[PDB]
Ligand SMILES: Nc1nc2c(ncn2[C@@H]2O[C@H](COP(=O)(O)OP(=O)(O)NP(=O)(O)O)[C@@H](O)[C@H]2O)c(=O)[nH]1
Ligand SMILES: [Mg+2]
């Protein structure tokens with residue numbers, strides 16, 4: 641409720657350039673690794689490799705649950721979702737392509753009902769979910785409180801930033817708090833970092849947190865920064 645000092649639970653959606661392997665140059669922008677390091681930061685539980693190329697069976701399992709988002713779990717309360725795009729492992733087109741909103745619209749969704757969705761660990765889990773802990777997304781539904789807007793600044797960047805700008809506009813229409821997160825800063829390019837900062841400075845009170853999921857720098861800070869903004 642709006643009158644409370646701390647709302648106590650925070651549903652955070654992590655978004656950024658997403659699509660086919662080709663649209664990502666066979667290299668995603670860092671959403672999954674950011675989420676993974678936040679929710680389960682131990683070396684034993686952190687995976688650098690989280691493919692979004694899935695079989696129809698993987699896509700229809702209870703972890704993916706016919707969604708283009710993943711429930712990464714609960715941090716203790718913060719519930720973490722990654723908005724992405726899953727492609728078929730034979731046709732290489734998005735799962736349910738004809739039925740889908742474009743990513744920018746999909747990713748800006750603030751009501752995320754996926755009943756009996758299980759928490760995601762890794763693509764190994766998929767269709768083998770009995771082999772992992774089975775934690776369900778709360779209430780089968782999340783009302784998004786805020787967004788982390790990811791930008792890969794590591795060494796086609798200008799097209800990424802164009803996409804980020806269009807995605808930002810969709811997010812801003814929600815009137816939900818947004819924090820820009822620069823990802824893979826352990827390999828960061830100063831020109832890219834500078835351009836990302838210029839973009840965020842063009843907006844009203846848009847903070848930028850510089851992160852590395854790989855080196856485990858500023859991951860908690862990115863999320864805490866958003867939680868603080870949510871409660872303002
Ligand atoms: N150097 C470096 N590489 C990283 C970092 N985070 C992720 N990566 C690399 O970038 C790859 C893609 O990261 P990933 O988190 O899966 O991206 P994504 O945005 O989830 N991709 P998708 O759009 O497919 O869901 C990883 O497999 C890893 O090689 C980081 O902090 N530093
Ligand atoms: Mg991912």
Ligand SMILES: [Mg+2]
Pocket residue numbers: 641642643644645646647870871872
């Ligand atoms: Mg409040």
